[PDB]
Amino acid sequence: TFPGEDTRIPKRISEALSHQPLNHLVPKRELSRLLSKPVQISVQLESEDAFEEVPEELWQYPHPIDLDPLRLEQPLRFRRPRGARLDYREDSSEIADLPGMGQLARACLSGTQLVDSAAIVESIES
Amino acid sequence: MVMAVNLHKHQKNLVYRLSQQYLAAARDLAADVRSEKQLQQYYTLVRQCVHGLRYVKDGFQLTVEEDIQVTLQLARVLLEETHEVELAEQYLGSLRTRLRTTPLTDARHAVEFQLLYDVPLAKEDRAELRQVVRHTTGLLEELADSDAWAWLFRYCRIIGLEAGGARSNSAVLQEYLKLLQLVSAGPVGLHAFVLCSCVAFILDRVVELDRSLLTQLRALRKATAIPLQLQMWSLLLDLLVAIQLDENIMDLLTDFKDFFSTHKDADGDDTVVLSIKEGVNVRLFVPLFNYHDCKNILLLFQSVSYLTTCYSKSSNFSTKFLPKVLKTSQELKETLQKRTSLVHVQSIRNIYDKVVDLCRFYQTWESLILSERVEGGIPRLQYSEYNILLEAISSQQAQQADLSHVGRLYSTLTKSKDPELRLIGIAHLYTLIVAELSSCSEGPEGISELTQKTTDAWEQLQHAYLSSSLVQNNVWKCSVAILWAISRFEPFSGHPIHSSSNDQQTLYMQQLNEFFTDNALFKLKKSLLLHFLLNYLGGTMLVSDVQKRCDISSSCFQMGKQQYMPGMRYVAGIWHLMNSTVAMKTKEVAITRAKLEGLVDKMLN
């Protein structure tokens, strides 16, 4: 005889190949793809700031100014980043204590409530 | 009363400036956002910005330069950070209309570009990118070839065309060559970006890269005013071409060594600004093209290239360095501190998540080459078809494999939009079918239908292969010639296929001989399975001498001990046992039989 004759073991190389993955043919395509994506492309006009400076004293205005005198009740929907590892802790500071942001900007935040988590979504159905 | 007077008098400008502050504060907060509370705070700050911009846009009669600035910034913030693409379109639409009654030509096109590129991108729908192509052709027709804006809208078009790459491959490519010709006169930086995009698109579709395009590609890193981030990309893309062709990358590794030394400390901006004409720039956000990120990905590239020589304690580069790129990429992800928007911070994090998932993919691939099972299971990657491929391979080399399940896995992959994955799937299906035909017992009518399945399979495999870049890949070329032979001669198959005439026969036999002679003594990558199958075919078909036949059958029998392939090592062993008997080598017959005896033990249990 010869060892393994009369067993199930594949004796021809084509029969044995059906149990051997072609492991020298290695996929490489997804390699090029993680580089080929310039994160952003954009056209921009080179031009002077069209909006004049205000008097520096007016930056000391102490009272809240109402931005939005109507519209957010069509509330805006925001993009919740796919793949974000998000945690739940209130250990962080309040919004009007965040840097930075000047003092009129902090005052205009007073009274407004936060964006609801419901308004921050990965996607819509429309 | 001066305060009250300033308040009402400079209200518009003041709110426009508050808006910028909320946005600065959001950019500061973005990379530290780690909780739901912080996510809400972040979008409360950008909401505050948008009310601000809207307050200026909706509530005042603006000059045209004021309207341009505020409207484009509003649209940009809404498209990037909100789901309000309709709102953005409305605002851009209003500006488009005002701009027609003015001589402000460049501004008008800038808005059109936002409607034709940025808006269909924000809609996340390929079908939206295809209707774009009609509006860009209209614009292009009206403009001269020397016009910067003709180049940009033509690039809008190539992007619209890139959606639906079915026979679309021909058009996109003609379109890039036309754009490259238009832009080769113009700004050298814009030409570099278009060139890089084309070679990337070719790599993505795995189609052959014309020599002249690679010459142009390499010329980008010449001793030139090309932005350094595009020179790097050009070098990375050159490496990838050699890696897709399974070529030696020694020289390209030195070019990297020159580039990293010649250009050190370059500090380093993540954005390239190209001036395409007086008054307008194109801005490329490229946060991977810097010293640390390229040293890291170059290591991954280097790993994939040597992956197959993981059996050898000399070029087992992949084993030493994949755990390093895995660690580095998780560090780069955690230490990310860029001052940009949250979606842009998560976009950079997602690339490091992809690097790590490819790392894990290639680690598993290496483990399956050297053993039957991977210690710890096969990892779930974000690449779902790479999962199916890993499931298939490990199932195929199991002790008692289920070949009807292996078949279904490899068939799913023959329907993949990845052309490389398709090829891999068809190649494996073919080997399964050939093994069915070889072991058939059904008589003339059964043998005949399986024969016909095998030739169908073989043709599907050949058509896929001949229309890809891998024709210039010698690992693939040698193995297509081997797969041809194993179905067509009687030791290898039990029912070989016979054809008329063929000229196919002289094709692949020339090839097999060409590879076998040059790789016995441009020579192939040194993948064990590939040289095993080459030497076994060659030793059986092409060698006359009995002592040389013994050299080869002994070499092939020992190969099967250097990595996991018991079935191959077995058939090399019975070949060697018969060669050692005809050669009347009586000691060697003794030990081969002894090895073989323990071999069948392990395989049968």
3D architecture notes:
The complex is a heterodimer of chains A (126) and B (605). By secondary structure, chain A is mostly loops. Chain A has a domain at 50-126. Chain A has helices at 13-17, 29-33, 103-108; strands at residues 40-45, 78-79, 120-121. A two-stranded parallel sheet of chain A has the order 2-3. Chain A is elongated. The termini of chain A are far apart. In chain B, strands 1-2 form a two-stranded antiparallel sheet. Among the domains of chain B are: 187-289, no CATH class; 301-382, no CATH class. The longest helix of chain B is centred in the middle third of the chain and has 29 residues, at 342-370. Chain B starts with a helix and ends with a helix. In chain B, helix 22 crosses helix 23. Chain B is mainly alpha-helical and 605 residues long. Chain B is built from 26 helices and 2 strands. The interface between A and B is large, with 96 and 159 residues. Strand 1 (40-45) of chain A pairs antiparallel with strand 2 of chain B, so a sheet runs across the interface. Chain B: One of its GO terms (cellular component) is nucleus. Chain B: One of its GO terms (biological process) is mitotic sister chromatid cohesion.
